[PDB]
Amino acid sequence: MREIVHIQAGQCGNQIGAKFWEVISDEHGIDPSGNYVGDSDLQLERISVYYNEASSHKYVPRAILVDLEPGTMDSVRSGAFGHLFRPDNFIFGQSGAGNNWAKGHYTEGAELVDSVLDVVRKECENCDCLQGFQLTHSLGGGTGSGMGTLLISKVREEYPDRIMNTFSVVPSPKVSDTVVEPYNATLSIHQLVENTDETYCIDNEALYDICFRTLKLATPTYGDLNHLVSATMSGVTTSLRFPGQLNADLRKLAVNMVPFPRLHFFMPGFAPLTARGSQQYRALTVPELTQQMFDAKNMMAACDPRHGRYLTVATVFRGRMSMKEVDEQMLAIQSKNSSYFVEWIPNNVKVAVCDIPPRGLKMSSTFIGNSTAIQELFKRISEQFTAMFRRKAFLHWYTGEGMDEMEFTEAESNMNDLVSEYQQYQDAT
Amino acid sequence: MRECISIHVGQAGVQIGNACWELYCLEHGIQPDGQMPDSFNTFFSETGAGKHVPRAVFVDLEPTVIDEVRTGTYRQLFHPEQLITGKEDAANNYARGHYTIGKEIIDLVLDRIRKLADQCTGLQGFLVFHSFGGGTGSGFTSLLMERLSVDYGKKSKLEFSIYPAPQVSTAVVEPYNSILTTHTTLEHSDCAFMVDNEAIYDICRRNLDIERPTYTNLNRLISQIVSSITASLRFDGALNVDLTNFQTNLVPYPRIHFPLATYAPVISAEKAYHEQLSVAEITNACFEPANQMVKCDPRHGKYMACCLLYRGDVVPKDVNAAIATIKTKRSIQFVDWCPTGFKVGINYQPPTVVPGGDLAKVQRAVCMLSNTTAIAEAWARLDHKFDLMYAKRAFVHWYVGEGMEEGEFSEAREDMAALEKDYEEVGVDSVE
Amino acid sequence: MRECISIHVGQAGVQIGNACWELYCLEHGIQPDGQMPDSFNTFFSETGAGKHVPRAVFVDLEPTVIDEVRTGTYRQLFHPEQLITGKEDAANNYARGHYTIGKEIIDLVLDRIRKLADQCTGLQGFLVFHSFGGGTGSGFTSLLMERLSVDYGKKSKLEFSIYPAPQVSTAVVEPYNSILTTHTTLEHSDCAFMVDNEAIYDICRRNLDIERPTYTNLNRLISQIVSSITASLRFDGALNVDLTNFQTNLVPYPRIHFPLATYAPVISAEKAYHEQLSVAEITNACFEPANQMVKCDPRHGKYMACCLLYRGDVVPKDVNAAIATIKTKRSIQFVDWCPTGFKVGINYQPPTVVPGGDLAKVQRAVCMLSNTTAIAEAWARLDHKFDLMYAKRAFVHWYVGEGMEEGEFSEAREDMAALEKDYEEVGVDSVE
Ligand SMILES: Nc1nc2c(ncn2[C@@H]2O[C@H](COP(=O)(O)OP(=O)(O)OP(=O)(O)O)[C@@H](O)[C@H]2O)c(=O)[nH]1
Ligand SMILES: Nc1nc2c(ncn2[C@@H]2O[C@H](COP(=O)(O)OP(=O)(O)OP(=O)(O)O)[C@@H](O)[C@H]2O)c(=O)[nH]1
Ligand SMILES: Nc1nc2c(ncn2[C@@H]2O[C@H](COP(=O)(O)OP(=O)(O)OP(=O)(O)O)[C@@H](O)[C@H]2O)c(=O)[nH]1
Ligand SMILES: [Mg+2]
Ligand SMILES: [Mg+2]
Ligand SMILES: [Mg+2]
């Protein structure tokens, strides 16, 4: 029960989903042909939450892959771990938005939204009990942002009761892969604060930093970053698919991490992170993982938490451990970081422990921080957009695709309102 | 002839019940298959065969824990009739577990309760096991206790509530759940037992020398407490005691019925020797505040009432001598208007060690139930937290959208203040 | 010495009879070849050899089902004399099965009935099994029952009618068939047993944990009901009961003779243990509305009469105690003018489990036959449907071209309204 439907938009979303479903299949011991050959009944007891068992004991991922270009879908169908997908799921157009949010939300999206919603409704009726949706996309490409916003709007208009998760790759401050990404980022963020339950902002800057420094890799490819994000997601949901001395679900996290409906943006963090040689030079201690999770260099969002305060903190542990040890860690870390938390929330740590570890390691930990520093990030983006809107550069594309300047005005206004709210609540005593 | 039924809400309740029924089976020599290669009549019913089943009820909204119980060792023992499961857990949201989701199966639970009651003749009371942090705990406890108190006018009702620790928390909205569920249970609970995880952690680490204890050990301890409480009914003693005796001896006023539990002896297996375990010795161990299972030093308050249940080979003369000596002490101070604050019960059956456990078998054991005024202080702390988390109106929107009013929060806070005021006011001495 | 014959109309009747005779053979230890490697004298006649044959009559217009019976396992058992077949089924058209096609073989069926009657000496009654939706069912039931009631003045006549479910339908013109056949059978049926497929579906799914039940299981249940009904005749008991006793105890007025059946216990094989199956327990199981085989909650009406047949090792003292306790309840309310609404029958023969079945063998079982006023409501629903499908005069042309008048529909509706009015009016209390 409590099945979760996976949706992927944007090229980055598709690559992340490819690696993520690879990880999931490996965890449940599912071959690329889709047959289970594992040895632990635990995997099969909750396999339904992510898979569907077709006859002859075949298993298919309950996933949807969406784009507007055939290249990425063709690549996915080409490589291994692509056969198990239902071949009818690959919805794709022919043009590709081309970093034009208006195209990805007005013209092209209006063509494939019908098929997307049809497949979504089919999947919804196919499952027993719907828990929520998790979305994968970008915020720079027009495809990702535009079509993701459109689908989120339609779905929320169709399911006001379900919980919605989004893993949006926020563009990095320093490095920008595009030229016009501030516009679409602003519009997509507007729609997200409109109709989303939680957003896991992630930057390629922070991921590159972690891969280069912590993992000691001079050549980080997209595969490595996608693998990291996949591990993060699997750790997020594993409290559902496995027993634990203190389990959590998406609803519990939503209640714990969202004090007020607007402030629902998080940052993730994973531990441990060890190189190929630097692994047997350390004891795997709950204190070690706890201290690893809390530091500037290990945050997947390019924003120093020291510049702000933590509104809420959640932690999910995997592998056997004693509760008392974790409790001691939490109390010690809250004692030493007394200046790093909001005052009006006592005991702002939400703990959860599973009982199955991440493949070959002995234990692991995932940290989800809802802090206030992230507003700084937004600030910068607005400034970028601000400059790029003062001269109205590149405006004519969106203008001739139906959008108007009032749209950008309202989007910037809403973003500034959100930043003001975040700053004000940081200053709350 | 004297039957008492169990209810388990939330994961904490289910695990506690696992430990409890494990212990009871070990006591009456009951196989996991209801066979025993009268005594058991209180808790176990007997089928046509030599198989017995426990008068237990398990309820939860997350089916994972119940599935674990079904796949656990104690599979064949339970009756799959009672293992009630839901679909989505209350998720630390009292509103979900008290207005939205609990309605889905409240009728089913009530039906099972009534069917079990009709097949019993000496129905004594209800043992409700539930935490406070979990929304399942608070919401379903409130709902079910209200329903049962509505149904049965005057029958014993006992709760084993996992009071949230002062500092070591797991959830974030624990103050809300705790305040709401306490405001609810204040009117229905005949007698509720506060237990905190932090105190048991301390006890296990310091006294049993277990540096990294798991939830299993805490469940073992609480199961021991429950077994010692009911041993008077389940067996014969030189001086037995019933639950109605407890409620008559520990409730000076209708509202003040929140005692705490303590157990002794608790020594590591390697420390089984090196002490003779005197009845006076175990008495001192019980009354030592380092062994009380709630984070409150009784030296800041007065014991309004105390009850001691001894089991094993004990003799009332030395027991009375030890108690009299205890009375002669100063820091152990009661109310002036109460001349004697001790109830004594004795059972001939010594406790039995849990196989694969951590404790060591003894010949004498003692459980203490104390209703004091120090515990009052604990409530204040929670209110403190609540106030802060209510000053900014944080997290309120979830409950609001689930069908709850802020006036409910205000009135619950007012009722908590009223209870604390009553506790403090009774704590004072009498005029002349 | 006491013989009772069976008739099966339509596919439902034939399959029900398959199950029934299967069960009877299992009871009296009868091979499919009439051998038994007195008791059986009621239902089985004996040839010159040690072979026995069942006093059964099968009639249908579609030869497929009868061919299946002939090719089934119970081939050698039946006498090919009675397996009457037609050419074209009535096809859910009461007119075809009551004016056009049924005339073709009504004489043959009557002849077989008379020949069977002449070889019997203790003729008790007729067990007619037939659905209502199928035109074969309604039409041939009306025709044959009219003929038999014309022939034999006063002899027992029992029907097991498959009342159409409130929502779960299979045909489209079910209201027409049901209304016509009920208007007909109201005057001829001594006592008819309403049974619905939806209720049995619910019972099998919830209580026997069978998520996907087939028609076979429903047939098993109904066969169990029939066997428990006749066990008093077919065997000895501390307090036996005959069909005339039933009709005298359950028919306060000549028109109101539409009871419903309920059976207990019904538990999965894996749930054979975990309960002792008390006589009070099975009594409660019977009286629980979730087990009644017709979609009507008796709490909306009053039980005008109730009869309980127990089989197995039972004792009248505890039975009487349980019944007295049942009377003390409130929601179970009868008419004021009836002081006692219970008839009791006891048989020493416990039921026997069907090999390859789904139930578990028990030592005591109880069938309940209840004549209440709640069932009246059911009729209204059908009338409702009929009215709509008659307001537009839909589908009428088939019946019109088959030799039927709209005035027949009008008069049948009027008679149904009259019966419902009588039911409601009797449901009221008495003056002073
Ligand atoms: N973290 C991560 N981000 C990626 C990866 N590959 C691409 N991206 C980001 O995703 C964006 C890709 O653009 P999309 O959102 O897919 O837009 P599109 O599908 O190409 O369609 P158009 O917008 O019309 O070009 C780029 O801006 C990158 O910043 C990856 O492997 N890992
Ligand atoms: N004594 C004891 N307490 C426990 C144990 N495990 C969990 N707890 C406490 O019980 C609470 C568990 O939450 P539940 O009451 O079960 O809530 P739930 O069933 O998950 O339903 P939701 O509230 O919607 O999440 C935690 O806050 C713990 O403090 C245990 O093993 N022993
Ligand atoms: N209890 C029970 N009822 C059944 C079963 N099979 C069919 N029925 C009911 O019986 C009806 C079958 O139609 P019949 O009465 O046999 O009609 P027929 O013999 O096909 O002749 P026509 O009416 O002309 O089609 C259906 O409407 C079902 O509701 C069964 O296995 N068990
Ligand atoms: Mg593209
Ligand atoms: Mg829960
Ligand atoms: Mg037919």
Q: How far apart are the first and last CA of chain C?
A: 48
Q: Which two tokens stand for residue B272?
A: 């089984």
CA B78 to chain centre: 22
Distance from CA of B122 to the nearest CA of C (A): 17
CB atoms within 10 A of CB C88: 12
Largest Cα span, chain B:
66
Helix ranges, C365-405 (H): 375-391, 396-401
Ligand 1 nearest-atom number relative to CA A181: 27
Alpha-carbon distance of B327 to B291, in angstroms, equals 19
In angstroms and rounded to an integer, the radius of gyration of the C-alpha atoms of chain C is: 21
Distance CA A281, CA A283 (A): 7
Q: Is B100 in the pocket of ligand 2 (CB under 6 A)?
A: no
CB C93 within 8 A of CB C171: no
Q: What is the largest CA-CA distance in chain A?
A: 63
Sign of CA dihedral C127, C131, C134, C139: positive
DSSP string, C286-349: HHSGGG-SSS--GGGS-EEEEEEEEEES--HHHHHHHHHHHHT-SSS---TT-S--EEEEEES-
Q: Which domain holds residue A363?
A: 265-374
With contact defined as beta carbons under 8 Å apart, do A364 and A405 qualify?
no
Interface of B with A in 393-432 (CB under 8 A): 394-395, 397-398
Mutate to test the pocket of ligand 1, among A92, A150, A168, A169 (most ligand atoms within 8 A of CB): A169
Contact A59, A47 (CB under 8 A): yes
Three-state secondary-structure class, residue B45: strand
Tokens matching residue B45: 């019913």
| Cβ–Cβ under 8 Å, residues C386 and C411 | no
Residues of B in contact with A2 (CB under 8 A): 87-88
Q: C155, A124, A346: which is closest to B172 by C-alpha?
A: A346
Contact C11, C134 (CB under 8 A): yes
Distance CA A92, CA B125 (A): 64
Examine the domain organization and report whether A157 and A233 are in the same domain: yes
Contact B85, B66 (CB under 8 A): yes
Residue C356 backbone dihedrals phi, psi, to 5 degrees: 70, 15
**Cβ of B297: how many Cβ atoms within 10 Å?**
12
- Quote the CA–CA distance of A31 and C149 in Å, as a whole number: 71
Those residues whose C-beta lies under 8 Å from the C-beta of residue B8, and which sit 6 or more positions away, are B14, B16, B17, B56, B57, B58, B59, B60, B128, B129, B130
Judge if the beta carbon of residue A292 lies within 6 A of ligand 1: no
Task: Go through C310-324 and write b for each residue having 16 or more CB atoms within 10 A of its CB, e for each that does not.
Answer: bbbebeeeebeebbe
Residue A377 has φ and ψ, to the nearest 5°, of: -45, -60
Joined together, the tokens standing for residue B317 give 């003369």
Measured CA to CA, the distance from residue A316 to residue A331 in angstroms comes to 16
Q: Do B174 and A347 touch (CB under 8 A)?
A: yes
Helix/strand/coil for B174: helix
Cα-atom radius of gyration of chain A, to the nearest Å? 21
Q: Return the DSSP state at B98.
A: I
Q: Is C254 on the interface with B (CB under 8 A)?
A: no
**Any idea what the CATH number is for the domain that residue A197 is in?**
3.40.50.1440
Q: What experimental approach yielded this model?
A: cryo-EM
d(CA A226, CA A234): 12
Are A124 and A242 members of one domain?
yes
Cα-to-chain-centroid distance, residue B105: 24
Kindly state whether residues A175 and A49 are assigned to the same domain. Answer: yes
Sequence-distant (6+) residues with CB within 8 A of B114 are B151
State whether A419 and A370 are in the same domain: no
Q: Is A223 on the interface with B (CB under 8 A)?
A: no
Helices B174-185 & B406-427 angle (0-180, nearest 10): 70
- B303-312 and B364-372 beta bridge pairing: antiparallel
CATH H superfamily, domain B260-376: Tubulin/FtsZ, C-terminal domain (3.30.1330.20)
User: Are A188 and A72 in the same domain?
Assistant: yes
Secondary structure, 3-state, C232-296: HHHCCCCECCCHHHHHHHHCCCCCCCCCEEEEECCCEHHHCCCCCCCHHHHHHHHHCHHHCCCCC
From A257, A283, A307, the end of a domain falls on: A257
End-to-end, the C-alpha distance of chain B in Å comes to: 48
The total number of structural domains in chain A stands at 3
| A4 CA to centre of own chain | 14
A142 annotated as ligand-binding = yes
Q: Supply φ then ψ for residue C294, to 5 degrees.
A: -135, 140
The tokens describing B269, both together, are 């297996």
Q: Which of A356, A374, A392 is the last residue of a domain?
A: A374
How many alpha carbons lie under 13 Å from residue C158 in its C-beta half-sphere? 21
Architecture of domain C3-250: 3-Layer(aba) Sandwich (3.40)
Pair of tokens at residue B244 = 């109605």
Whether A325 and A386 map to the same domain: the answer is no
Closest CA to C14 of C64, C49, C48: C64
**Residue ranges of the domains in chain C?**
3-250, 260-376
Q: CA C92 to CA C392: how far, in whole Å?
A: 19
8 Å CB contact between A168 and A201 = yes
Domain check: are A159 and A44 in the same one?
A: yes
- Beta carbons within 8 Å of A249's beta carbon, 6+ residues apart: A2, A131, A239, A240, B62, B88, B89, B91
Which residue minimizes the CA distance to atom 7 of ligand 3? C12
